[PDB]
Amino acid sequence: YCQKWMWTCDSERKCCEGMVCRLWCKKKLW
């Protein structure tokens, strides 16, 4: 599916909508 808030993330395991990968998924400001 996609990686949720604070889940690990990488090139293939992308963060869910509204988040950005910084090793773990973080909320985007925009």
Binding site for Cl ion (CB under 5 A): 26-29
Q: How far is the CB of 8 from Cl ion (least distance, A)?
A: 15
Minimal distance, residue 27 CB to Cl ion, in Å: 4
Our CA dihedral for 2, 9, 16, 26, rounded to 10 degrees, sits at 160
Give the ranges where 1-30 is alpha helix by DSSP (H): none
What is the closest distance, in whole angstroms, from the C-beta atom of residue 1 to Cl ion in the complex? 20
**Residue 13 or residue 18: which is nearer to Cl ion going by CB?**
18
